[PDB]
Amino acid sequence: CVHTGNIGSKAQTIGEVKRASSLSECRARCQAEKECSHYTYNVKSGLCYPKRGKPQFYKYLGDMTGSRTC
């Protein structure tokens, strides 16, 4: 649900990519958008990708995709 994985999602980010100091932060960033079904937190650059709609998973080292909430 919210344990790293290193999987990126090709699902459209619901807005501008905001950087998050933690994956936890990016979770709250997803909790913000009602459309957000999951988020891809790129821990590597520290970027948070709150993503809407259905997901699409790919192997990206650094991308932690939390399924919105666990």
Tab-separated table of C-alpha atoms in Angstrom:
chain	number	residue	atom	x	y	z
A	1	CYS	CA	0.000	0.000	0.000
A	2	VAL	CA	2.614	2.596	1.058
A	3	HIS	CA	5.953	0.770	1.280
A	4	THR	CA	8.370	2.110	-1.351
A	5	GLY	CA	8.435	-0.483	-4.126
A	6	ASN	CA	10.474	1.633	-6.558
A	7	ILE	CA	7.565	1.702	-8.959
A	8	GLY	CA	6.565	4.782	-10.890
A	9	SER	CA	3.083	5.475	-12.179
A	10	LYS	CA	2.233	6.836	-15.627
A	11	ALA	CA	-0.995	8.179	-14.170
A	12	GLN	CA	-1.370	11.909	-14.684
A	13	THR	CA	-0.301	14.054	-11.764
A	14	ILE	CA	-3.352	16.002	-10.570
A	15	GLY	CA	-1.406	19.226	-10.804
A	16	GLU	CA	2.021	20.797	-10.541
A	17	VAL	CA	4.645	18.477	-9.111
A	18	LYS	CA	5.444	19.751	-5.650
A	19	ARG	CA	8.498	18.519	-3.796
A	20	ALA	CA	7.901	16.678	-0.547
A	21	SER	CA	10.350	16.372	2.337
A	22	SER	CA	8.865	12.960	3.114
A	23	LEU	CA	6.685	10.284	1.530
A	24	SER	CA	4.344	10.946	4.439
A	25	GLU	CA	4.056	14.539	3.233
A	26	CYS	CA	3.231	13.305	-0.261
A	27	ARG	CA	0.492	11.149	1.272
A	28	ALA	CA	-1.164	14.235	2.749
A	29	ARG	CA	-0.617	15.847	-0.642
A	30	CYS	CA	-2.675	13.001	-2.103
A	31	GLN	CA	-5.255	13.299	0.697
A	32	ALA	CA	-5.695	16.850	-0.538
A	33	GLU	CA	-6.960	15.899	-3.989
A	34	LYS	CA	-10.211	13.951	-3.890
A	35	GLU	CA	-9.313	12.660	-7.350
A	36	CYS	CA	-6.043	11.236	-6.021
A	37	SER	CA	-6.218	7.462	-5.904
A	38	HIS	CA	-2.463	7.101	-5.397
A	39	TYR	CA	0.759	9.098	-5.442
A	40	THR	CA	4.261	8.572	-6.756
A	41	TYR	CA	6.800	10.052	-4.399
A	42	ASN	CA	10.120	10.297	-6.152
A	43	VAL	CA	12.298	10.172	-3.070
A	44	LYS	CA	15.363	10.508	-5.276
A	45	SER	CA	14.743	14.134	-6.273
A	46	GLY	CA	12.244	14.608	-3.465
A	47	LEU	CA	9.312	15.162	-5.807
A	48	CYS	CA	5.715	14.292	-4.977
A	49	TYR	CA	3.408	13.108	-7.750
A	50	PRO	CA	-0.217	13.060	-6.552
A	51	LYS	CA	-1.928	11.054	-9.258
A	52	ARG	CA	-5.551	10.718	-10.234
A	53	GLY	CA	-7.564	8.023	-11.953
A	54	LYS	CA	-6.292	4.508	-12.623
A	55	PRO	CA	-2.595	3.688	-12.119
A	56	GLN	CA	0.058	2.326	-14.457
A	57	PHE	CA	3.151	0.812	-12.885
A	58	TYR	CA	6.718	0.769	-14.148
A	59	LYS	CA	10.087	0.048	-12.557
A	60	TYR	CA	11.640	3.356	-11.517
A	61	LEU	CA	14.244	3.313	-8.760
A	62	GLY	CA	13.457	6.200	-6.453
A	63	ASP	CA	9.719	6.363	-7.125
A	64	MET	CA	7.633	5.253	-4.179
A	65	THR	CA	3.989	4.841	-5.080
A	66	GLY	CA	1.697	5.043	-2.101
A	67	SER	CA	-1.872	3.983	-2.834
A	68	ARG	CA	-3.240	7.227	-1.333
A	69	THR	CA	-3.808	5.742	2.115
A	70	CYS	CA	-3.207	2.403	3.796
